[PDB]
Amino acid sequence: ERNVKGMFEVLEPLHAMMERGPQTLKETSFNQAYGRDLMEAQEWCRKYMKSGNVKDLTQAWDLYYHVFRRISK
C-alpha cells in the first residue's frame, strides 16, 4: 500500500514497549540478541521521518528483514 505512516503506527508501540527495559530472562535474552539492530533500524526510521528520502528507509527495512528472518527460523 506504500503507507509509511501506517507501518510507523504498526511498529512504534513495539519500540515503545522495548524501551522500558526487559523484566524477565526471556526478554533480556531477546534484548541481548536483537536489540542493537532494533535500535539502529529505529534510528534510520527517525532519520527518514525527519528528512524524507528512501535512502534512509531502505537500510532500516534491511535491518528489519534481517531481524524477521532470524526470528522466523
Binding site: 506504500r2 528512501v54 537500510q59 527495512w61 534491511d62
Partner: protein, 133 residues
C-alpha cells in the same frame, strides 16, 4: 517523485538530469574539468535521462534485500535491451557513491559492480591523453 509514479505506470509505456546528488565533486569525471582543464561531457544519444533514474531506483530498491531477484531481472533486462546506458561515467559515479553510503549485501554489491565491468569509458581516457601531452 519518480518512485511514486513508477508504481502505477510501467517501463514500456513511459517511453512513448536523472541523478539526485550529482555535483562537480564526488564524480569520477566532473572533478577534473576545473582542476585539469578536462573537456565537458558529451551529449549522449530525455530518451536516456529516464533510464538513468530507472536504473538508479532499481539499485536503491536492491539495497533493502527484500526481493532482490526481481530487481536482478529488471536490471539485466535494462542491460540486455540498452547496453549503452551503462557507459556514462557520471552514472557509475553516483551508483558507487550510493554503494558508499548504504547497506548492500555482498552478492548484491558484486552484481552491481559486475554490471559496470564491460565498459569502455573512451572520452575520459582520451581527455587524459589530451591533457597528458
Amino acid at each position: 517523485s519518480f518512485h511514486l509514479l513508477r508504481q502505477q505506470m510501467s517501463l514500456t509505456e513511459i517511453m512513448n538530469t536523472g541523478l539526485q546528488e550529482h555535483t562537480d565533486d564526488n564524480c569520477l569525471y566532473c572533478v577534473c574539468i576545473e582542476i585539469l582543464g578536462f573537456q565537458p561531457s558529451n551529449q549522449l544519444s530525455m530518451c536516456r535521462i529516464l533510464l538513468r533514474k530507472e536504473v538508479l531506483r532499481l539499485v536503491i530498491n536492491l539495497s533493502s534485500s527484500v526481493s532482490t531477484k526481481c530487481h536482478e531481472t529488471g536490471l539485466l533486462t535494462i542491460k540486455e535491451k540498452y547496453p549503452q546506458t551503462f557507459d556514462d561515467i557520471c552514472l557509475y559515479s553516483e551508483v558507487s557513491h550510493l554503494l558508499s553510503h548504504c547497506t548492500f549485501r555482498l552478492p548484491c554489491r558484486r552484481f552491481i559492480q559486475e554490471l559496470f565491468q564491460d565498459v569502455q569509458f573512451l572520452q575520459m581516457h582520451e581527455e587524459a591523453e589530451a591533457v597528458l601531452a
